[PDB]
Structure 1
């Protein structure tokens, strides 16, 4: 299987395998899945970036993460033969937890098993602790890759710090750059730079990238993200991503 699914029962084993690989495959692609958006930040804000930060901060703080996908690559885009992508399935309770009914239905139709998440779902606290020690974060050897990544990284900071997210955005970014000193936001590149508005799969399609796995699942999406990035890096940047785009976050 190209996607290695991770639950509370094999978390430890799976992280070990990733720690064994991270030095040879130091480009980490990520996607997340949460229970949608359930509320908007009231009032008027310092800017539009500040409206966005508070929308994100409000949502991350209160809504539990459901899946995180991590796809490893080396500096020229090769996946480990061991796994194209990992999919960490976190703990989640349908009657007890908060969420948009629509997101849940979408996820269910997407292949999710909310029964198994309630049972053997992973605790974000445990995963985050392993992540901090993994060599994936806090290391500039490792590049992180994501699509629209305030949310992806907020959910991470959330679990690693174990405290509520920063009040002002400029702090959120200071911390971000601590744990992920070297990262590319694909949305920022496709949009802010190449003036392409299209979303992940649309971009995936115009490039004819074969999707491995179901849509709307973190593992398969993180993989798609990886492949998109490398296709983009060769097609339009001739092999080298302009590093003026390093650490640039779309909409912040």
Structure 2
């Protein structure tokens, strides 16, 4: 079974007021704690050849606004620093004046995001040169990632999403030259034995359903604990001796 130490189970909320001091912390940590996981959460509801899948994410990401973004840092073994936070939940500005659906119309403190939320443009500047991007010594961990990468890449580009899947893939590989989709790795592992959800993954590893994991910050924590535990068990190998790296850079 898997029982991460108590002090790892902590998510630091980031608002406009602490955005900079928290990035300073993230910059010191990245050389040693070079595995980073990401989770996102967006406001509305997605709107109506796996080119159909890409084309819908494209339009949606272009339109919709991410409201929270979760980052967690560990080393290759799931070790985290013993001082200060190593998981963050960035809370983004929310503007009801521009949001189509009313707040009253169909988990989140909308008022707070409105008064205290992060400017996505300031966020993207601090991420660009933080040490996390465009560097294959850093390992990105995602889960069922298309929309997360969609939203993250759109934030970094500060431009329209790419016309097609191939262009989108080009961009992801540049910003994130070393990344895994844990959803895919787990599914390939279960197929050497023939759900795939993260919680089902976490349970299968004997990880307690801590309450900390329910939030966006908490979900990036959970996928990072899981990826690392799972990778330690098998030594980064599939049941047939093949390396996980076989699926580096592949989405879904």
TM-score by length of 1: 0.86
Equivalent residue number for residue 25 of structure 2: 17
Give the CA deviation at 1:214.
4.6
Q: Which residue of 2 aligns with 1:203?
A: 201
Mapped to 2, the partners of 1:92 and 1:192 lie a distance apart of 39
Aligned in 2, Cα 1:166/1:216: closer, same or farther, shift over 3 Å? farther
The answer to whether the 8 A contact 1:37-1:100 is kept is no
Alpha-carbon distance in 2 for matches of 1:214, 1:55: 32
- Counterpart CA distance in 2 for 1:193 and 1:58 is 33
Aligned to 1:91: 93
**d(CA) in 2 for partners of 1:95, 1:213:** 33
CA offsets 1:211-252 (integer angstroms, 9 cap, x no match): 4545542110000000111122133x33455210111111xx
Q: Are 1:30 and 1:70, in contact at CA under 8 Å, matched by a contact in 2?
A: yes
SS at match of 1:145: strand
Structure 1 residue runs of 4 or more that deviate by more than 4 Å after TM superposition: 99-102, 211-216
Residues 1:89 and 1:54: Cα distance change in structure 2 (over 3 Å) = same
In the TM superposition, what is the alpha-carbon distance from 1:171 to its structure 2 partner?
Answer: 0.4
8 Å contact kept, 1:67–1:89? yes
Which residue of the partner structure matches residue 43 of structure 1?
A: none
Could you tell me whether the CA contact under 8 Å between 2:11 and 2:212 is conserved in 1? no
Unaligned runs of 5+ in 2: 1-6, 238-242
Given that 2:67 and 2:91 are in contact with CA atoms closer than 8 Å, whether structure 1 keeps it comes out as: yes
The structural deviation recorded for 1:96 is 3.1
* 1:43-82 equivalence runs, <5 A: 47=49, 49-81=50-82, 82=84
Map 1:1-252; keep pairs closer than 5 Å.
2-40=10-48, 47=49, 49-81=50-82, 82-94=84-96, 96-98=98-100, 108=107, 112-195=108-191, 197-235=195-233, 237-240=234-237, 242-250=244-252
Unaligned runs of 5+ in 1: 41-46
Separation in 1 of the partners of 2:67 and 2:157? 18
SS of equivalent residue, structure 1 residue 119: helix
Q: In 2, distance between residues paired with 1:230 and 1:100?
A: 40
- RMSD, aligned α-carbons: 2.2
Residues 22-31 or 239-248, more deviating? 239-248
Contact 1:69-1:88 within 8 A present in 2 as well: yes
Alpha carbons 1:36, 1:100 under 8 Å: kept: no
Distance 1:4 1:11, change over 3 A: same
Contact residue 148 and residue 187 of structure 1 kept, 8 A: yes
Relative to the length of structure 2, the TM-score reads 0.86
Could you say if the C-alpha distance between residues 11 and 212 of structure 1 is closer, same or farther in structure 2, counting changes exceeding 3 Å?
farther
> In 1, Cα distance between the equivalents of 2:227 and 2:20?
29
Question: What's the counterpart of residue 44 of structure 1?
Answer: none
Count of equivalent residues = 236
